[PDB]
């Protein structure tokens, strides 16, 4: 029965197309984002557990050199912060402050890369969730005025040339609302999860730079 | 017109509960703004004395008579200095633990102080997020009840159901209008609490440095 | 449920999903208040017990047998002491590094406890944010179904749609009635969860402080 696209105006066809595309894009973003978020969290916690399990830093770095291309999560931060740290330590850098500050900078850069990679299309989800029921409202007002101009032409509505405007308005608001549903459903959840991951990475940096300072000042 | 006897029982209950919510929000508004103004006035009025030039030990000696009457900054100073003195006297061998203990005491005292200060604020935000919704429930109930009532008459006369529909609109007339002052006061008072929090944070940043410089001279 | 005996192709799932949401929200709020009150009381009791004269070893060995039933800050104390002992007895690295491991263990235990406590709170917030939109989707779908279901093009006798409009608006009414309690409960529970988190970090910091002193000697 859904054949309103042909029995509708061009502008309202355009806004329905925009909104259905937005909804499908949001759903695809959800499916492609939740899996990667869960995998990243699992990998981060696993590597954090392995880091504290009485293993020397050198052995962990040697084993983590390994797959140097498809390396992500906290392990990437550790590798990036240790390789440059040892390079500086061997490349003179007699001042411990220089090497530990370099390690902190490396932790910084690695997190600011990995987290930004994780946080993709999430602001888009928030934007669509916030703005869909105003594109819907614009389409609905267009339908209402298209109905009113038709009404203002004869002595009776006749329920034949006014129904298209009613259908336009109703479909516009329904489609806008259906687009807005998943976005508002999941934007806050995913943002909170990303913030939790950010806190985890920050605490990992704190512990790692504390250990690095201790090691550098020991000798 | 009163438009209460004509209104259904549920609609009247909605008006009553929403009036009560507005009363509570305004009372909390007045109490919280008064208390925050008093605290802000006392903040700098104690900070200048703390930094006027009088000795810290002498000022603490002046304290301890107002044990339970101390306000925010005064109580923070009292707790911090008492904890630092207790640690130094009991141990008398801490290289740098005294400043850490003083910082911990300052942090917990600050957290307690603000948790007491914004004691009722996270109710305003909880009435601003439902007042439109309870009003919309009221007007929806009015509209659907009126339409159900228009199911037996002939000619499908609509003007005859003019009052009830209008009554539903009045549900949101005493509806959303119970939310706007709530949300604005919530935002403004949270901003004030945040500025006070920043002020106390700077107070700690100064006080920990003071103990850091004083520990090696005692 | 006189209106809800036939439903429609898509309106059947609508308002049944919302009734389920409301029932689940009610169960979640009652269970969350119960467990939150129990956890707060247990935390206060453990604070009183631990701030007494009992030493760390006695309290540590007292709760050895509880294991799986140990909930609250006692689990934090147990995990921290276990981690610290496992390093101290198996002396491997400097004495100022095992305390970092103990703090890490305590923090992960605290995060696990917070996750356990805050279990269905995001669901409550989600449904509070979500419900009105399914409500309005349902009522607009019902309006469309009623309009398209009009057999004759004109049908000058229009005195049959009112039950249809009432059924359509029932969807939004139920959705919003489910929205309001969830929206209130979300904040009402998040405040207590934040309080528990804060007084947990207080205990964690205090415990770390005390064990730091004996870390360099014991």
């Amino acid at each position: 029965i859904l054949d309103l696209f042909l029995k509708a105006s061009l502008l309202v066809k355009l806004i329905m197309l925009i909104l259905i595309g937005f909804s499908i894009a949001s759903w695809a973003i959800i499916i492609q984002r939740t899996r990667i978020l869960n995998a990243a969290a699992r990998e981060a916690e696993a590597f954090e557990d392995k880091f504290w399990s009485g293993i020397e830093l050198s052995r962990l770095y040697q084993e983590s050199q390994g797959k140097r291309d498809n390396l992500t999560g906290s392990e990437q931060i550790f590798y990036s912060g240790f390789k440059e740290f040892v390079r500086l330590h061997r490349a003179n850098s007699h001042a411990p402050e220089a090497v530990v500050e370099g390690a902190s900078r490396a932790m910084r850069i690695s997190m600011n890369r990995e987290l930004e990679n994780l946080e993709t299309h999430i602001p888009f989800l928030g934007t669509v969730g916030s703005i869909s029921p105003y594109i819907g409202l614009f389409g609905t007002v267009w339908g209402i005025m298209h109905a009113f101009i038709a009404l203002g032409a004869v002595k009776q509505a006749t329920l034949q040339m006014v129904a298209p405007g009613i259908a336009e308005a109703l479909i516009a608001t329904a489609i806008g609302l259906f687009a807005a549903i998943p976005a508002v459903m999941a934007y806050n959840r995913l943002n909170q999860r990303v913030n939790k991951l950010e806190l985890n990475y920050d605490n990992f940096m704190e512990e790692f730079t504390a250990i690095l300072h201790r090691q550098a000042f020991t000798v | 017109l009163d438009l209460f006897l004509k209104a259904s029982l549920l609609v009247k209950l909605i008006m009553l509960i929403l009036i009560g919510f507005s009363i509570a929000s305004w009372a909390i508004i007045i109490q919280r703004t008064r208390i925050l103004n008093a605290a802000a006035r006392e903040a700098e009025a104690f900070e200048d004395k703390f930094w006027s030039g009088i000795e810290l030990s002498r000022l603490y000696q002046e304290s301890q008579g107002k044990r339970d009457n101390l306000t925010g900054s005064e109580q923070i100073f009292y707790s911090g200095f008492k904890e630092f003195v207790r640690l130094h006297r009991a141990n008398s061998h801490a290289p740098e633990a005294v400043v850490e203990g003083a910082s911990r005491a300052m942090r917990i005292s600050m957290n307690r102080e603000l948790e007491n200060l914004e004691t009722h604020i996270p109710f305003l935000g909880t009435v601003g997020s439902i007042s439109p919704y309870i009003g919309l429930f009221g007007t929806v109930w009015g509209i659907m009840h009126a339409f159900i009532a228009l199911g037996a008459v002939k000619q499908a006369t609509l003007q005859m159901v003019a009052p009830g529909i209008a009554e539903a609109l009045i549900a949101t007339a005493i509806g959303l209008f119970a939310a706007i002052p709530a949300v604005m006061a919530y935002n403004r008072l949270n901003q004030r609490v945040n500025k006070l929090e920043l002020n106390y944070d700077n107070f700690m940043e100064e006080f920990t440095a003071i103990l850091h410089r004083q520990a090696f001279t005692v | 449920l006189d209106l809800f005996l036939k439903a429609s192709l898509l309106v059947k799932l609508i308002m049944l999903i919302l009734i389920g949401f409301s029932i689940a929200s009610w169960a979640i709020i009652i269970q969350r208040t119960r467990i939150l009150n129990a956890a707060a009381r247990e935390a206060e009791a453990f604070e009183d017990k631990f701030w007494s004269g009992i030493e760390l070893s006695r309290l540590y060995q007292e709760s050895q047998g509880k294991r799986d039933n140990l909930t609250g800050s006692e689990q934090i104390f147990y995990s921290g002491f276990k981690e610290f002992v496992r390093l101290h007895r198996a002396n491997s690295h400097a004495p100022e590094a095992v305390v970092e491991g103990a703090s890490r263990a305590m923090r992960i235990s605290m995060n696990r406890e917070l996750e356990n406590l805050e279990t269905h709170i995001p669901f409550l917030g989600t449904v509070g944010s979500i419900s009105p939109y399914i409500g309005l989707f349902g009522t607009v779908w019902g309006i469309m179904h009623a309009f398209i279901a009009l057999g004759a093009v004109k049908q000058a006798t229009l005195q049959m749609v009112a039950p249809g409009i009432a059924e359509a608006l029932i969807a939004t009414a139920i959705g919003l009635f489910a929205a309001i309690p969830a929206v209130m409960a979300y904040n009402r529970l998040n405040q207590r969860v934040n309080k528990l988190e804060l007084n947990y970090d207080n205990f964690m910091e205090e415990f770390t402080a005390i064990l730091h002193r004996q870390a360099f000697t014991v």
Partner: peptide
């Protein structure tokens, strides 16, 4: 943690009323 009122549900009910009164 809510500091914003929702006008979409407020507007949409009267909007549906408008379409109802159109016919």
């Amino acid at each position: 943690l809510k500091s914003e009122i929702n006008i979409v549900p407020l507007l949409d009910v009267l909007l549906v009323l408008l379409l109802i009164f159109m016919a």
